[PDB]
Amino acid sequence: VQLVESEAEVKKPGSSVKVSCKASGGTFSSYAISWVRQAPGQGLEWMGGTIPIFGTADYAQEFQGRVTITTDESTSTAYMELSGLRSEDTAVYYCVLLGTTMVTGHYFDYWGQGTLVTVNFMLTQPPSASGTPGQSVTISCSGSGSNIGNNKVNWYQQLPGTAPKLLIYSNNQRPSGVPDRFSGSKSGTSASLAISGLQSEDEADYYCAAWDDGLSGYVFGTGTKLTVLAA
Ligand SMILES: NCCOCCOCCNC(=O)CCC(=O)NCCC[n+]1ccc(Cc2sc3ccccc3[n+]2CCCS(=O)(=O)O)c2ccccc21
């Protein structure tokens, strides 16, 4: 399963940009495509997405007016257009496949590597965390009843200069490939990611996330920079 987004684009203020992404080697029609952006040095912001079967698009309220998401089933290609470009809109624009696995049918999540385009509610996380290799650290995520209280929590790892990767879904489930030293949990309006037997490769940004019934949008945490201190 393979994502290819459009090449990096410099753009004039006031204009509009269409980012594309093409997906290969799966059932395109069975995926939800979502779009998430990240300004340099900053966090994640859901713009919107399509849902399968119905083919209907939906949008984060800060972007209503300005965004048109569209999907071409023929070419297995999603498109995101945002207009009225300001400097604030400078960001890496990620397309994200959401789906269920073929055999067991559990959730999964695949992020494109992002299109840099050159020209805000969030869950609470501590800004930083650290440990020496072998140690255990726990990263916390705090929200409210309308999000973490009522909805499934995901955790995303983000290595420097790379796209987020799903670590935990459905509060405590690990995708295939994720080591059992990562553990998820939630209780009330609060969630936790536990990392045991810490390794240098874990130096990364960790984001919790969940849907919010009040806002009617997908909400990321402020993120936690985990520094693995030698040694
Ligand atoms: N007077 C009116 C007052 O009352 C309102 C009544 O009127 C009706 C109110 N209307 C509704 O019920 C709308 C509900 C609905 O299904 N929307 C369509 C879809 C909207 N959506 C879109 C997207 C997501 C999840 C997303 S977006 C995304 C982007 C990147 C990475 C992950 C990611 N993820 C994670 C998904 C995994 S999990 O599910 O969280 O584990 C949703 C998650 C849950 C529910 C809806 C979701």
Q: How far apart are CA 52 and CA 201, in angstroms?
A: 35
Here the tokens at position 117 are: 């385009």
* Å from CA of 96 to ligand 1 middle: 15
Locus of tokens 């040095």? 41
State whether 31 and 97 are in the same domain: yes
Please say whether the beta carbons of 193 and 167 come within 8 A.
yes
- Give yes or no for a contact between 79 and 72, defined as CB atoms under 8 angstroms apart: yes
Cα–Cα distance, 135 to 16 (Å, whole number) = 48
CA pair distance 173, 107, nearest whole angstrom: 9
Are residue 102 and residue 156 in the same domain, yes or no? no
Nearest CA to ligand 1 atom 29: 34
Q: 218 CA to middle of ligand 1, Å?
A: 7
The verdict on 126 and 178 lying in the same domain is yes
Handedness of CA 177, 183, 187, 190 (dihedral sign): negative
The minimum-distance atom of ligand 1 relative to the CA of 170 is: 41
- Tell me whether residue 173 is in a domain: yes
Resolution in A: 2.7
Domain that holds residue 142: 121-222
Q: Select from 94, 120, 146 the last residue of a domain.
A: 120
Judge if 104 and 127 occupy the same domain: no
Q: How close is the Cα of 225 to the center of ligand 1, in Å?
A: 28
Domain boundary residue among 120, 137, 170?
A: 120
Q: Ligand 1 within 6 A of 96 CB? A: yes
14: left (phi over 0), alpha (psi -120 to 50) or beta: left
In a domain, 83, yes or no: yes
